[PDB]
Every structure is written in C-alpha cells, then in structure tokens.
Amino acid sequence: MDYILGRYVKIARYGSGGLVGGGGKEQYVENLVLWENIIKTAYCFITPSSYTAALETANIPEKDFSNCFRFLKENFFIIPGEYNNSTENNRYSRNFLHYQSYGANPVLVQDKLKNAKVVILGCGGIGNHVSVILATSGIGEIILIDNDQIENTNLTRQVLFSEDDVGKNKTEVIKRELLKRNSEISVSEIALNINDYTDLHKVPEADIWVVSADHPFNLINWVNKYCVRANQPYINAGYVNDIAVFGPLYVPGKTGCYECQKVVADLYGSEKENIDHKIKLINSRFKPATFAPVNNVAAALCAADVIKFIGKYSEPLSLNKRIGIWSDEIKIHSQNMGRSPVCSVCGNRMLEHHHHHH
Amino acid sequence: MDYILGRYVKIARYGSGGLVGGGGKEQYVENLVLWENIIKTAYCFITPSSYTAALETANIPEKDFSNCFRFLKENFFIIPGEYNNENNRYSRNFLHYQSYGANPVLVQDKLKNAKVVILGCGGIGNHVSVILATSGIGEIILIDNDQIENTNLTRQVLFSEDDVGKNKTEVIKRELLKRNSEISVSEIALNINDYTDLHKVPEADIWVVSADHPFNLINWVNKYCVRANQPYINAGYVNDIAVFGPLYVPGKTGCYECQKVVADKENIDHKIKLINSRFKPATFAPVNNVAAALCAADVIKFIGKYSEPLSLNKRIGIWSDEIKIHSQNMGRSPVCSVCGNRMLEHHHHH
Amino acid sequence: MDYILGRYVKIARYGSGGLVGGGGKEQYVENLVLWENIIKTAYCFITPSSYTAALETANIPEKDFSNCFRFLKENFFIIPGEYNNTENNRYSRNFLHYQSYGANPVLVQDKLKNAKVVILGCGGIGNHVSVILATSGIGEIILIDNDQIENTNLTRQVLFSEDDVGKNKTEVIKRELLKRNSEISVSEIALNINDYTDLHKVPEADIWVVSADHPFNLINWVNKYCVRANQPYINAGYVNDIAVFGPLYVPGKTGCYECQKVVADLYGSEKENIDHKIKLINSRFKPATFAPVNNVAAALCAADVIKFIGKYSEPLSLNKRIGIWSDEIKIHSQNMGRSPVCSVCGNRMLEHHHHHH
Amino acid sequence: MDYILGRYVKIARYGSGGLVGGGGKEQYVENLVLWENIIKTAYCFITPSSYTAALETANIPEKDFSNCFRFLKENFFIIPGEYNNSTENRYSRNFLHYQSYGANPVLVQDKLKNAKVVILGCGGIGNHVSVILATSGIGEIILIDNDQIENTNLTRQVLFSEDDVGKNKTEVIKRELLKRNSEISVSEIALNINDYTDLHKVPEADIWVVSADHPFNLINWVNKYCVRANQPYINAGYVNDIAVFGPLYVPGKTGCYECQKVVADLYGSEKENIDHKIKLINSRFKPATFAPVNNVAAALCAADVIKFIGKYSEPLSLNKRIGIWSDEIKIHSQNMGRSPVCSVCGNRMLEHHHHHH
Numbered sequence A: 001m002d003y004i005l006g007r008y009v010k011i012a013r014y015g016s017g018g019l020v021g022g023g024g025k026e027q028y029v030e031n032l033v034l035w036e037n038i039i040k041t042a043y044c045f046i047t048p049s050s051y052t053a054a055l056e057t058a059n060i061p062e063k064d065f066s067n068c069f070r071f072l073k074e075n076f077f078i079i080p081g082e083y084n085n086s087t088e089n090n091r092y093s094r095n096f097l098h099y100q101s102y103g104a105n106p107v108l109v110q111d112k113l114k115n116a117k118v119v120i121l122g123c124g125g126i127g128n129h130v131s132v133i134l135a136t137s138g139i140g141e142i143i144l145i146d147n148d149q150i151e152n153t154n155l156t157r158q159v160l161f162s163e164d165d166v167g168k169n170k171t172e173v174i175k176r177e178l179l180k181r182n183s184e185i186s187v188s189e190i191a192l193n194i195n196d197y198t199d200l201h202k203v204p205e206a207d208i209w210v211v212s213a214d215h216p217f218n219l220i221n222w223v224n225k226y227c228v229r230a231n232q233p234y235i236n237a238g239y240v241n242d243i244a245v246f247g248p249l250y251v252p253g254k255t256g257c258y259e260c261q262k263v264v265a266d267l268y269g270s271e272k273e274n275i276d277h278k279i280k281l282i283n284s285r286f287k288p289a290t291f292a293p294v295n296n297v298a299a300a301l302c303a304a305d306v307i308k309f310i311g312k313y314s315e316p317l318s319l320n321k322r323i324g325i326w327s328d329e330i331k332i333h334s335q336n337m338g339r340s341p342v343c344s345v346c347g348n349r350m351l352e353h354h355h356h357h358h
Numbered sequence B: 001m002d003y004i005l006g007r008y009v010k011i012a013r014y015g016s017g018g019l020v021g022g023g024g025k026e027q028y029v030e031n032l033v034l035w036e037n038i039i040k041t042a043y044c045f046i047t048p049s050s051y052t053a054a055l056e057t058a059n060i061p062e063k064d065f066s067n068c069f070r071f072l073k074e075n076f077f078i079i080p081g082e083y084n085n086e087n088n089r090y091s092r093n094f095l096h097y098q099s100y101g102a103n104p105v106l107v108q109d110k111l112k113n114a115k116v117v118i119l120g121c122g123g124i125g126n127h128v129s130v131i132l133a134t135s136g137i138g139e140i141i142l143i144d145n146d147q148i149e150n151t152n153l154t155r156q157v158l159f160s161e162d163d164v165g166k167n168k169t170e171v172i173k174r175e176l177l178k179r180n181s182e183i184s185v186s187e188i189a190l191n192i193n194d195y196t197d198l199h200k201v202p203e204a205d206i207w208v209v210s211a212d213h214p215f216n217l218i219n220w221v222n223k224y225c226v227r228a229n230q231p232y233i234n235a236g237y238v239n240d241i242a243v244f245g246p247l248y249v250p251g252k253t254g255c256y257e258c259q260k261v262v263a264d265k266e267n268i269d270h271k272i273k274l275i276n277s278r279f280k281p282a283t284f285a286p287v288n289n290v291a292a293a294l295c296a297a298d299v300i301k302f303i304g305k306y307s308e309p310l311s312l313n314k315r316i317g318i319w320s321d322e323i324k325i326h327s328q329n330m331g332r333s334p335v336c337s338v339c340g341n342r343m344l345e346h347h348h349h350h
Numbered sequence C: 001m002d003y004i005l006g007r008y009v010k011i012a013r014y015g016s017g018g019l020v021g022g023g024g025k026e027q028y029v030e031n032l033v034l035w036e037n038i039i040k041t042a043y044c045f046i047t048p049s050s051y052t053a054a055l056e057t058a059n060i061p062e063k064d065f066s067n068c069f070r071f072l073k074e075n076f077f078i079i080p081g082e083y084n085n086t087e088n089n090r091y092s093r094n095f096l097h098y099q100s101y102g103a104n105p106v107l108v109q110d111k112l113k114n115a116k117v118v119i120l121g122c123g124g125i126g127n128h129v130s131v132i133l134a135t136s137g138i139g140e141i142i143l144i145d146n147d148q149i150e151n152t153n154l155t156r157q158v159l160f161s162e163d164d165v166g167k168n169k170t171e172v173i174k175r176e177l178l179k180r181n182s183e184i185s186v187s188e189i190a191l192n193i194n195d196y197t198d199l200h201k202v203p204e205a206d207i208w209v210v211s212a213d214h215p216f217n218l219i220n221w222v223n224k225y226c227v228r229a230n231q232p233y234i235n236a237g238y239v240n241d242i243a244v245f246g247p248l249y250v251p252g253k254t255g256c257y258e259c260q261k262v263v264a265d266l267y268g269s270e271k272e273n274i275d276h277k278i279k280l281i282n283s284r285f286k287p288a289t290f291a292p293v294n295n296v297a298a299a300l301c302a303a304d305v306i307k308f309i310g311k312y313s314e315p316l317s318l319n320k321r322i323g324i325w326s327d328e329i330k331i332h333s334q335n336m337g338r339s340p341v342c343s344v345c346g347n348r349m350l351e352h353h354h355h356h357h
Numbered sequence D: 001m002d003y004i005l006g007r008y009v010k011i012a013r014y015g016s017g018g019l020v021g022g023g024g025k026e027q028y029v030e031n032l033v034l035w036e037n038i039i040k041t042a043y044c045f046i047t048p049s050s051y052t053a054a055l056e057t058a059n060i061p062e063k064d065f066s067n068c069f070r071f072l073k074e075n076f077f078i079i080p081g082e083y084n085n086s087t088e089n090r091y092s093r094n095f096l097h098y099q100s101y102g103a104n105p106v107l108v109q110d111k112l113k114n115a116k117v118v119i120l121g122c123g124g125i126g127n128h129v130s131v132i133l134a135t136s137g138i139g140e141i142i143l144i145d146n147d148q149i150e151n152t153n154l155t156r157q158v159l160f161s162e163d164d165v166g167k168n169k170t171e172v173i174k175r176e177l178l179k180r181n182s183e184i185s186v187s188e189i190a191l192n193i194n195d196y197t198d199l200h201k202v203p204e205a206d207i208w209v210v211s212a213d214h215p216f217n218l219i220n221w222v223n224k225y226c227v228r229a230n231q232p233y234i235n236a237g238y239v240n241d242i243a244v245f246g247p248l249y250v251p252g253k254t255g256c257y258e259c260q261k262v263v264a265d266l267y268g269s270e271k272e273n274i275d276h277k278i279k280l281i282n283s284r285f286k287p288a289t290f291a292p293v294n295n296v297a298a299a300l301c302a303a304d305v306i307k308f309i310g311k312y313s314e315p316l317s318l319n320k321r322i323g324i325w326s327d328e329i330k331i332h333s334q335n336m337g338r339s340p341v342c343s344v345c346g347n348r349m350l351e352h353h354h355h356h357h
C-alpha cells in the first residue's frame, strides 16, 4: 500500500508548534518537536511509497514515524497512491483535490455523481441555479419539474436566461443551457406544478429531490409528509425576504424530518372577525422583497450538500438543520431538526410522564 | 404627503400578540392590543393616504395611532407613495430597496450611471459580473488575458463546452449582452504582472479584485488605490473557504495593510519551502459562488447607497465543511505606512 | 505673443493621474484625461509658439486646449518667449528661479544691478548676507563697521582666513566680494553705531540690513530713524540657540518695529532683595551661539532682500518677525503689522478746520 | 564635584512664574514661590561651588535647595566646574553652546578633531557644509568630486572666485579650507558617482555628507550601499525652491531612506504616444534653484553632523526627511523611522493575523 502527500497540504510555523493543511481540514499542533517530525515524515511521502520504503529514508526514530504517519493518514494529508490516477485534465480535475482532501477516492466519487438521478422540484431562481452547479459537477441525470414560462422580471434572479427567452418554458431553456454546459448528461422535463398535495405522486423516484419553490408557502409541509411516507430523500432551499434558507436534507431512517422538532412558526389569523378580514387582506397583497445574491447563496450551499450526499465523501451541512444566512449582517443561524421518536410524521411513539406506582 | 403599505409586509397571530414584517425585519409585538392597533392603522395605507386622512379613517385614539404610524414608518412597512411608481424588470428588486427605506428609482439610477471594473474574469469575477449585469449595473469592464480551458468549466458557470479555446473576456461579454442588451461592456486584454500594470486599468466607481495569481495582487491594488482614491473590493478562496476581503473606501475604512502585523533548524526550513512550493489549491465550485454572491451584494449596496456593505473594515470567511462565518478586522490604523499621515508640520504664526 | 515651456517643468505619472511642476509650485492632476491633455499641450511649447499655432498643432478640441493653456500659464509653467533668449550668462540659474515666479529675469537682474544695499554691522550675519547678495549681482554694497577681525570670529564668519586676524572686517570682506564679483562697487564706512545720532552718517539705500548684535536697542534707533527717513530696512540676529529674521519695514506699506509692542506690567520683580539678584545674573550674560544658526538667519534675510529689490514675490518678513529653532525643528512667526495708535509711525495729528461750500 | 552657573543663563519675570534659560533650552516655571527659589539657589552657584558649600550661603529651607539644585542641574543651568577650563581658544564661542546642552566642551572638540568626514559631491551644498565643518574643528575632510568650476557656479558656491573657473572643485575647496584652518587635513578623490558600484571606491568615515543632486536617485544608491556597508550618512539637497535635508542614517539605531514611502519611483505613461511626450519634456529639465535655499539646507545639515560626531545632542534629522519652504513660512517633516519590514534594512515580513477557528 503506497501513500503520497496531497498536493493541497500547506505548512507554516504558528503558536507553540505549527499548522498542517489549509482551509477546513487544517490542523493545529502544540508540540513544536512533533510538528518538525510531521514535516520530516511528510517529506518522505512526497513520492508514492509504502510505509516501510518511506521509513527507510527517515532520520527520526521508527517510533515517532508511526505517530506522524497515523496523524497524516487520518487527516488525509497523505493518501493512497491509487487516489492519484491522472487522466487528460479530466474536466473534473479542479474537483479532485477537494475530494482527496476529505479522504475519498475521487474516481469513486465521480462515478456516483455520474450514476445519480436528481429531481429539481421547481425551477425559479434557486432550482435554476442548483441544476447548473450539479450539471457542471457531473450529475448524470437531472429531472426538471415546472410548468411556468419565463417572464420579464425573472431575468434578475435566474442567471441562465436571455432576453431572447421570455415566453418560453423554464424547463425548455434550462434543459438547452445544461446541455451546452455538459453534453454527457441526460435531462428530462415534466410540465407540472405542485398545486395540491396529491400532485406529488406524479414526481419520480430519484437519489434526492431539490425542493425550492417559494410558493405555496406550505409546499415543504407537503413534500415532507410525502417524502417520509414514500421513503424519498429531499433537501429544501428558499428565502424569507432577505434571508437565505437551506436545509434540512432529509435521509429516511437516518435523520430528522421537517416536523421532528416542530421548529418553524405556526400560522394563525385573528380570533376577532373584524381584525381577521384586515389581516386576510394585507396578506393577500403580499409579494416577497427578494435580492438575487441571497437566492445564489442558498442555491450554492444547497448544491454543495447534494454533491456530498450522493458522493458519500463528507457529512452534508444540513442534516438535521434548517440554516439561515443573513444578507444585511454577518449572521448564520441553525435550527435543530434532529430525529424525534415522537414526531407526528415519522416514527411511531408517544411522549409521557413517569407514573410512579408507590 | 402620501404613504403606502409595502407589499412585502406579512402579519400572523403569535404568542401573546403577533408578527409584523417578514425577513431580516420581522417584529414580534407582545401586546395584543398594540398589534391589533398596528393592523388597524396599516389597513389605512393599502391605499395611499396622508397621515391626517388615515387618522380620520382609523377609529382609534390619536395617542395610539401616532405610535403605530411611527412603528410602521420607522421599519419601512409604510413608505412614501412617491416610491411606488412601469411594467419594469427590476421591480422585484424595487421591493427590496423599498424595504430598506430607499427610493427604488434612485437606487436603479445610481446603478445605471455606475461603472465597475472586474479585475480577474476567472470564476469569482465571472460570477460577480452576471449578478451585476442582471441587477442593472450600467457598465462593466472586463480585464483578463487568459483563454477558456476545458478544466475551467467546473467553476465558471457562464461557459459552454463550445467555448473552450476562446478568450474569457470575450465570451462573458456576449453573455452579459444576451442577458442585458441595455448595458455596455468593454474588454482589456491584460493580466497584472507588475505593480505598473495597474496604470492601464481605468477609473471606476469600484474595482472587483478576484484573481488568485500573483499571491500578492491585493498588495499592489491597495498601494495603487489608496493613492488613486479608488474604492475596491477583494474576493477569493483559501482551499474550501470562500473569502470576501475588505471593501476599501478612500479615507473612510482603512486599507488592506492597516491591520497587518510584524510576524514571527534550517534543515527543516528547507523542507517546508519545498513542500509549499508544490501547493495546488483544493478548491470547491459551490464556494466560488458563495463568495462571488456576497461580494456582488456588497457592490450593489456600495453603488446603491441604501444600506451598509458587510465588507467595510472586514475580511469575511464562509466555511464549507462546517457552518461557520468568521469576520476579521481590517479597520483603519493611525500608524499604517500605506494610508497613514507620514507628514508633520513644524510652522506656526504667533 | 510666443509662449515657451519653462525648463523647470517636470512630469510624472502618479495615482489617478499625475504631477506637473515639482517644488513649491508642484501640482497633482487627479483626472488622467486632463493630465494627458496638459502634457499634450505643454508639448506644443517646447519650441516657442503663439496660442493660435499651438491650438492647430495639438489635436484636442478647443474647449480642452483652453483649460490646459490657462493651467500652464497661471502657474508659469509656460512663460512669454521674450523671458528667455546667453550669450554666456553667470546668473542664468537664478533666471529659472525668477521665471518660475512669473517674472522677467532680465528686469529682475536689472533691478538688482541698479540697487544699493547698506550692511549695517559686518559681524557674521551681515558678513554672510553680503556674499549672498554680492553673489546674486546686487550692484553696490556699503559695509559699515569699525571692528577688527579677532581670532575667535573665525568660527562664525565664513569669509575669513586665519591670516586675516588683525585687519578690518570691512576691508577684508570688500576684497573677498571683489574676487567673487569684479562687476560690483563696494564702499566702507569705519563706524559703529554708538548713539542715535550716528545714523545720520549712514547713506540712503534701497534697503538697510541691520544685523549687529549690540547695542541691544540698535533696532529701536534704526526704526525711529527709518520711519522718519522713509528708509526700508530688515533686522536679523539670534537669541542664543535661535536664528531670528525680520521684520522687513516698508514705509507706508507695513508695520514698524514699534507697532506691536505692549505695556509690560511685570517690569522687573516685586521683592527688592531678589530683584537685584536677577539683575546681577543677567549682567553676567554671554550668549551661547551656534555657527550654523548665523547661516540660516543670514540666508533667509538675504532672500527677503533679493525679493524686496527684485519685486518678483513677497518677502516672508513683511509684518513678521521669524524665529528658526536649532535643537528642535520649528519655525515661529510673530506679528509686526501696522498699529493705528503707534507712537512712532502713527499720527500726531488732528485737523479741526472746515469750509461749508 | 563643584558646580557653576552657566554664563548663558538669563532670567525674567513672566506669567504666573518665570523664565530661566533663554533659547531652545528655555524653561517656564509656574509656581512663583519655586521660581524665586530657583534664582536664589542659582545665585549661590555663580562661584564654582560644591553642593554643601553653596548651601551654607543659602537662606532657604534645606529641602527646597535640593529641588532647585536638581532643576538647574538637569536643565544644564548649572554645570560641573571642570567644564570651564579652555584657553586665552578660537572655539570659545562654540563652547557655551556645548555647555548649555550638557556636554564637556573639551570632550566635544576632541571628538571633532578626531573625526573623518566625507563630502560626497562638492556642489553648492557640499561646498558650504565643508566650510562650516572646517571652521568648527572637524579634523579630517575628504572631498569627492570630478568637476571643474564653471561660470554659473559662482552664484551658489560661496568659496569660488572669478579666477577659479576652469580649476577642479576639490582643488579650490581644499586651498580655501586650509586658509581657514591649517590644523586640519583634507584629501581629494577625483570621482563622480555615475554607477551604483562607484560607491565601493568611497572611503569609510564617521559619516558621509551626501549632497550631489544628479542623478535624482543618488540617494537610493547611497542608502542601499550604506545600509550594507554599515556606514552612517546624511543627505541634503533641494527640490526647486524647497531646501531638503535628512535623514541622518545611523546603522544600529535608525530608519533608512526606504523604511517608509516617497515617490515609489517615477512612472511614465502606459500609452506610448504620451510616454514619448513626457520623456522629451523631462529630458529638457533644469532645476529652478535659489542660492539662499542651498545655504539653509547646507547649514542645518552641518549642524546635524556636528551633533552626531560630538555626541552632545540629538541630531534633528534622525528618522526624518525635512523640507524648508522659501516662498512661505513652512517646515514639513516626513517620517522615516525604522521599519522591521523594510526591504533594505529589515529582516522580517508583514502578515495578517491567521485565526485558527
């Protein structure tokens, strides 16, 4: 078993020891003498070589070599030599170092993406944008579900549309634009909007559903019930005026669902009739105050989670979480949506006080 | 003067009272009576009305009305009637500007009459330009001298397979024109290899500085911009971490240098150099997008003058394998060699 | 009317645009297009040219050309061709300096040549001022001192050889000025000013340089005299550590040395026992002077004289007494502008007659 | 250890307290009780006297005498009696100045006689500096230049006669400095610095006076070389009518010319048709100079060299480039204090904090 140093590993002196690696997977080491030894070990693995062959060129004592090795190995600073097979720039090279640095065989990862089916449930700004990122990263099959046509005002949000495209169907244009970007992938269309809960029966099985159509406000409740019942993984994305929302990513039997922690606000009108008519009116007039850069942020983090989910190389960020990114301040909130045994949508079980008999 | 209720205000009964608002501006009103009173007053304005006419129409004592009115005005829930007037493609943004208390017509104008330079059309700048083009920025200037590689197709969301071989600059111009034929775009076949290259880059409302090579590009842009009085914004990544560096504005925010610090076996020192010499960034497409988008957001805010850019005095990092957004200080330093007063005056009368 | 570009004009790309000029008169032009336009037009004038011919030659529209021309003219970056025409001129470095101030160097030289300066006290500062003036072509100097060169003076008085200890200050500096400039005429007057009346011996001159470090109130007599004689003068000296120059007095135009003086309530001291002790300590006073200070004062004082006679820019000394520190970097200015109620140059003086016509 | 009152101390009633000192070393004391006490005790020291011997003569609280003593001592109003042995001297004028700054005047002169100073470039500034340094007692002077005296030099370089045109500058300066002080030695080196590498030929000295004005970038060279060769220097010159002097670079203990910013280098245009224009305009350039400015830079420069060598006071141009305006009362200093990160004399890089999490 030959190991090799990742081309993404950086080193610098800092604190009472040093830093190994860069970005998310960066490690900080206390003992300056250990830090030296890690550098020493790392050097030996610059060329793909077995544990014994690398050791044979080290100066440090065999014992410390075993420590550094395990360290560098577990952190993914040195990786199996196989994980390095080149190919002719392979289009997805700029993504291979990323997978390596998380400890995955980049070839396994791409194969999974190539073999995945992903449904875009709703093709406004967000689904639009997720599908590009997914196509562009090698998702094999994409199913575009929508029934609207490209309007005038859509051109601010939906980064794929020309002035030339007003009037045409959303899925039509997204479909041609994804084919321009990657002709090795297959894409289908379904002329459908979820107007009633039962419409969901018409949506096909896939590895995951991307669920982002801001209307109806309660689409997620539907999608959640349906997906729990139908054993179907989904991830949700959207916005609330100027906050970008994404998550949960729901995985049947392995995570919580949208109702588990009964997190988000219940909607009510008024008990007094004369003020309820006023509320009904005000809410009928409602249009969201959106901002395209927020659109984009939710969409990209969302697409990121899908890639991890199907590529099986890292824990997606939005397991058990609804996540809000603020745009008028540096602020990220996370709502807990971990599995609840007592959820009224998934799991069969009730919540009770102890009854002490004596 | 007429006021009108913004179309972006929602209401819901909640807890001891209820909600008025929606997004980053939602408000819980705990006192039921006051909430009801707010609805009662908000209702006068679905249809434009002066303050005094609305006081007539509502049937609550002037004492209470006056609070509810200030509450509505102060949060921009009601806004001047003028701010509402068409068949306009930017009209979804208009609500956003309204909700910030601006006048959407003036914000569009400011964007129309602005000029933005993208310095580095590789990925982040790529993406930033689209967002800016589609929000109605009047003129973009594209500054790259590289060719579209096959391998760039992963990060640079504007390009077809067809496009490999062609000039980065040139493709994105036809795309921005397809998306917005009203705006004008220019190309400058230039990469920045010496400090001196920046003299070729024109004067603009702001500069977007994305490109990853050379490692000390910001340094020159900074030096240049401090003495050129040129506002600029930095953006980029560090492996899987998206970064949108400080937005610098002439003698208001302090520069990329202000917060810098003095800083820190020659057999191991030889090895660290070598290893680092071999560095290739482990980079992740959805990251470019996050940084590009927040960077583009600060630009619209900067030109639109409707709320504070997040980037003032701060370098922001968004993680991707973790939910984490850290902010780093880049506020002004008095003793800073680049933007600090190096002069002293020794003269005086009586 | 030919204009021409001054040889003291420099250009550099800087910042949003660039610099034009260099020195006291340097300018930063923030708009690149206008800077570019300024040099495009400056280029027409390297060889002499009318405004008209330069307009044709430059290929920028009339509107822009007109600004650039004015910009170049206003700052004397371009100057009348007449101011330039050599054959082989000794003063031609200064000529650039005058040009840069907007003057006609020939007229400035003339005014210098046809002037006459009295150095009233040829001990160090005066010593130095005279060389500087002789060197710039002041046509006639009159040296006024009755002292002998002592060995100790060699520290402050730059013109003197060890050889010269013994001879008359006046006499040496006269030969030294002729060595430097055989063009000019120089006169001596073996005279120290010992009481007011001595000043009647000092001749009329375009200006008087008043340096002598004693008697303490020499300035006062010179003031009295010059106010009533209509004689312009400039004071110069030191206070230990500190070089001092000005005011430069101009009859009618400026303040006199008296104008800003004040009643001084704290006369000496209260307690008689200590008052005579302060007097005793001060009686023993000897100034701690520093040679380079002599030079600073003398030089600025000489500069004001050349400007006064040359009429090309304002002397700094007008209405001001200036002090330059030496153990600290620091320049202080003190007010000496006109006072209406001043004994020396104010009125007597009232008229009580009128005719109803 | 006997103490004596400096012969340069003056006293006056002023404000709430009084003044003790006169000159840059002048002190303002507020409590009039303390003031009179200071004068009381000063009187006691007019005669060279030990602390206790002076005390007997004093009619004030023994504790109060101790404060005044410490005041007058720290400020150099009283000085050790040893500091008064001189001769019947030539440098006696300078001696009170050194006393008043708290140095043994004799220590200081010895250092001056034992110093070697290089004048790198003998234009107007170098010229004038050498005279001042010579007449102040600098033991050895090394004049480096390869020019001949021209016609037009006589306006600036206050040592040259009309009979000297044609001769080498160092030749004439050397004769003129020997007339002024034959107790000193002077060498010549026929050398102009045309390339950076010519600096290897300049001898080692206590300090270099670097005053030559061509090329504009002499100082850059001299700075690099001096940093590398461990060589103190001080720089002086002019920008048209502004007189510049400083930094004085001291190897261990000071900033260098590049420790901060100025100019960053000329830039021309990035458009070719405009670069050719600026290229031509700049080739025609001659400075607009004013001799009185020369003198100011030269004098303050010499002053700093005297302090540096005599180790008696802080030179003014440490960590500073100083501009003295001549068309107005204006002095600016640019900060050139030491940078750890300087790319000429620093061993360290500038980094942002990296926060792990």
Ligand SMILES: [Zn+2]
Pocket (backbone or CB within 6 Å): A256, A257, A258, A259, A260, A261, A339, A340, A343, A344, A345, A346, A347
């Ligand atoms: Zn559940």
Ligand SMILES: [Zn+2]
Pocket (backbone or CB within 6 Å): B254, B255, B256, B257, B258, B333, B336, B337, B338, B339, B340
């Ligand atoms: Zn700064």
Ligand SMILES: [Zn+2]
Pocket (backbone or CB within 6 Å): C255, C256, C257, C258, C259, C338, C339, C342, C343, C344, C345, C346
């Ligand atoms: Zn008067």
Ligand SMILES: [Zn+2]
Pocket (backbone or CB within 6 Å): D255, D256, D257, D258, D259, D338, D339, D342, D343, D344, D345, D346
């Ligand atoms: Zn330095």
